[PDB]
Design a protein around this ligand. Structure first.
Ligand SMILES: Nc1ncc(-c2cnn(C3CCNCC3)c2)c2cc(-c3cccc4ccsc34)oc12
Length: 295
């Protein structure tokens, strides 16, 4: 239907907690709850907030941040406080990082595709994310439930047709999603080795460069991953196809519901040979798979 009204004086604003694509997001409280709000940096970016609100009023899905309300006091949005921060932090952030498992890796990606597919299926016209990357993916329920935010995006995750200002579509989000699958399995910043300014990744990716292949990555996941990387957007699978495939694969990745609670001391062997090592472990997957099939 449509969104709630929340005057700014009812909100109890606390510290900043991750600047978005254009605005700025902060921790806050509202009516005996924990809440996160975003406000305009300058008045010049008022236009986007009006476009954002009409979209977010329509969206309602478990893998998308639940908007509570808004106002035009200092004009702001009011969301659910994701206790676990962004996925980017979990993967690459502060000194003590959480241990996670292959089950978590796939669960997150599955949940992300469920959200993106909800947006792709939207009527009367589809919503393309464009800016799809871990800093925009948030985690709740002890790191178990993943949620998307910020619609309407560094080069590392951008599909190559977006660089060249060409007639892109929903398939660019699929490319991004492919990169994230590599990122969570390996726990590596994609194209970190290239470095330099953004245009050097864009050149590299535009010429064919993709992240390295992962050692002992099951073929089913490898082919899905590499198909999402297709230079040709039409050769990439729909997000609805990815949701189906991932769902099926989750049978061989039990224990996704276990909260993150174990510390992790990680060297992460930098020596990029031909391939790289996964951070997660696929032994349990091969085991369970072998039980269903032959090998
Ligand atoms: N709704 C949110 N709740 C909590 C956090 C959050 C992020 N970090 N932390 C804490 C977690 C506990 N430890 C300290 C950091 C909480 C965040 C971050 C964002 C966000 C980031 C980038 C773009 C956009 C666009 C709309 S919302 C949003 O939204 C958040």
């Amino acid at each position: 239907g449509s969104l709630h009204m929340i005057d700014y004086k009812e909100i109890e604003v606390e510290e900043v907690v991750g600047r978005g694509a254009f605005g700025v997001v902060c921790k806050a409280k509202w009516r005996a709850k924990d809440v996160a709000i975003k406000q305009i940096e300058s008045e010049s970016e008022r236009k986007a907030f009006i476009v954002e609100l009409r979209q977010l009023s329509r969206v309602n899905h478990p893998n998308i941040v639940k908007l509570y309300g808004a106002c035009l006091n200092p004009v702001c949005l009011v969301m659910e406080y994701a206790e676990g921060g962004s996925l980017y932090n979990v993967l690459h952030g502060a000194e003590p990082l959480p241990y996670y498992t292959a089950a978590h890796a796939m669960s997150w990606c599955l949940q992300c595709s469920q959200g993106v597919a909800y947006l792709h299926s939207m009527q009367p016209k589809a919503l393309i994310h464009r800016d799809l990357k871990p800093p925009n993916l948030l985690l709740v329920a002890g790191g178990t439930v993943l949620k998307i935010c910020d619609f309407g995006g560094s080069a590392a995750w951008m599909a190559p047709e977006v660089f060249e200002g060409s007639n892109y579509s929903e398939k660019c989000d699929v490319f991004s999603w492919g990169i994230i699958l590599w990122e969570v399995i390996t726990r590596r910043k994609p194209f970190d080795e290239i470095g330099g300014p953004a245009f050097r990744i864009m050149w590299a990716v535009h010429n064919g460069t993709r992240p390295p292949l992962i050692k002992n990555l099951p073929k089913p996941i490898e082919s899905l991953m590499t198909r999402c990387w297709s230079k040709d957007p039409s050769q990439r699978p729909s997000m609805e196809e990815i949701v189906k495939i991932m769902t099926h694969l989750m049978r061989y990745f039990p224990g996704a519901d276990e909260p993150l609670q174990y510390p992790c001391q990680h060297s992460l062997p930098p020596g990029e040979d031909g391939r790289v090592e996964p951070y997660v472990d696929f032994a349990e997957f091969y085991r369970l798979w072998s039980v269903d099939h032959g090998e």
